[PDB]
Amino acid sequence: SLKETIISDIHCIITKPDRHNLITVVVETNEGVTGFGCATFQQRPLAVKTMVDEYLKPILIGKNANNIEDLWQMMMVNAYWRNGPVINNAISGVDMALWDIKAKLAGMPLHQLFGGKSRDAIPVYTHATSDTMEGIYDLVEGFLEKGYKHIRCQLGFDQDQYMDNTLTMFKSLREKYGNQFHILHDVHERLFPNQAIQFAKEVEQYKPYFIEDILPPNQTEWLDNIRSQSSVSLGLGELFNNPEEWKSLIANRRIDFIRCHVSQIGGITPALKLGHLCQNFGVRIAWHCPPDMTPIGAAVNTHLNVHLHNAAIQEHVEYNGNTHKVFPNAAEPINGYLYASEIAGIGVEIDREAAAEFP
Template sequence: MNIVSAEVVVCSPGRNFVTLLVTTDDGLVGVGDATLNGRELAVASYLQDHIAPLLVGRDAQAIEGTWQYFYRGAYWRRGPVTMAAIAAVDVALWDIKAQAAGMPLYQLLGGRSRETIRAYGHAHGRDIAELADSVRERKEQGFDAVRVQVGIPGNDPGYGISGTPGKPRYEPAIAGPRPTEERWDAGSYLRFIPKVFENIRQEFGDELDLLHDVHHRLTPIEAARLGKSLEPYHPFWLEDVTVAENQQSMRTVREHTTVPLAMGETYNSLVDYLQLIPEQLIDYVRSAVTHSGGVTGLRRILDFAAVYQIRSAAHGPTDISPIGLAASLHIDVSHHAFGIQEYMQHEETVFDVFDVGYSFDRGAFQPGERAGLGVVFDQSAAAKHPYKQAYLPVNRLRDGTVHDW
């Protein structure tokens, strides 16, 4: 079974997505997600100009060999652009293999390890009262685990906060020629977040799992202080508490708090975890299928993590297309190291382009029983939603210094 074409499609049904379609001489079409939020065209070019010409004529069944060919053969290894491109190829080939076998992808990955896939939802508000309303909505949808983000006095508008009451913030990347800019002050944040957790716990009790994303904005000792201050409210985790590049900084955080830690959203290979996992400096791996080399790449990371009782929590907001989410779900249901799946609902227009086989109900997913990945990409519908230039925000301290976003 040989590859006869590889086509890259960039579309924007509510937000920008990069999709790879790989077609075989048997007429099977595999789909892969290559979306890199705010840098979509860089991956599209990498695929179209450098990878697609080398795919034509290759054996579509040779997934491992193809993965190594594009990872080792390019000399320039790793990095988000390279690994997102490799991920798209890898997922498309797994999709083809499972279609050819006539079974859903998770069956090729070893079958079920669990009955359902637990997910956590996103709740946000410009203040605590609005956040509580959002948490209540997530509970009504069946979530028993919720990420809570709230506006911080003096930090306007704040990470993960919609500017419109009651409307989910589907996409932090804003269309336009330049990024928007936000302001950040760690002192006001550290004083306010414990009050947020105290209020949410008082209203919703101890049974609801609460997660919080710091988004790399604290120094190690500030992150340690945050973890220690939140221990009475037993968070499910704190995510990305400090910059991801300095892995040894997590030792400082770990020494000062027992709150579980999640990291890896910006990581794109097993190499990124060579210190964090063996030293057990984190509890959850946050890498996405789309950004870490596909099904093959993420499974390698999770196999390594499982040795140290570290679990998966695949990145899954709206900058992951339904293709990337579907691939995550097939891993989630089959891999022993699964922990929880992030889920932020796509806009309805997304499903005009992506016909999905997975399902969600009462806080849990099923990957579906369609052969392959279970996602069909409608090119004619995609053509109605052309690319729109968009950037993630830039973050600055109060004095104007560019800070981690």
């Protein structure tokens, strides 16, 4: 007894209440049921907006929003060339908006629409980056006081100096805090493969929650060398926009955490399927939630994270007063956990007037 949901208009609002350009996609329908979605391309806000305004919107107006995957498949192949940061982001904002419409139509929280909760809340990790161990302590202790139990620690913001200081960082952190928290670290592709394998063996004893981006970006074939000699947990996927980047990685158990950005791989639609894939292959899920993701994206990740069986942790995003003003009711971690929204829909929208104040 759901009737066709006809797409009447599409907007793409960029706003700068804080450090970053924030991109919201707005899908309006004849019923006056409105959907909101998040795109995130700060280095390139304008490319995304053009892609939505005069390429996505023409092929969407008039369409039945009810059939989300149909509309997904159609957008994804429309330019013929496909898979990249600009297109997937644009499509992801619409995909998210379509899911939002469906959940409002269903009168339910987005994660309930998916099928319900696997857990009550998702743990959160924060970022401690400093040039000195003193600075990292200062930051760690403040996060501890707030209930966080996972913290990404980066000492220093040549390759040998970085590897040496980082092992010293892991060593001092275990000496000072033992097992009070899990320690995450992103290598940011700074190592040659031989250096990567060496570092994986040396850092193993310190039991990182995961080491992210330990290899240069098209050298994943070197993972088998690492995984045959080290038990170190590994995350990859942050810059992926293309299934070829994650398919063999996961089928071959070459990583422990997938770290894709939901908007970079095309939205909720592909995120659910990749979530199920991860569960099949025993890989955990830690989607990125960067500084320029809006409270709308973050709310979507929390819905994903209480629903998907293999979701492990959500990445923290601050929000200043401006941002909370532009996106009302944006949840914040309580004792180190993010709670899914409980009203119908995504549960967070953008205040268009407020977003005006901040062009």
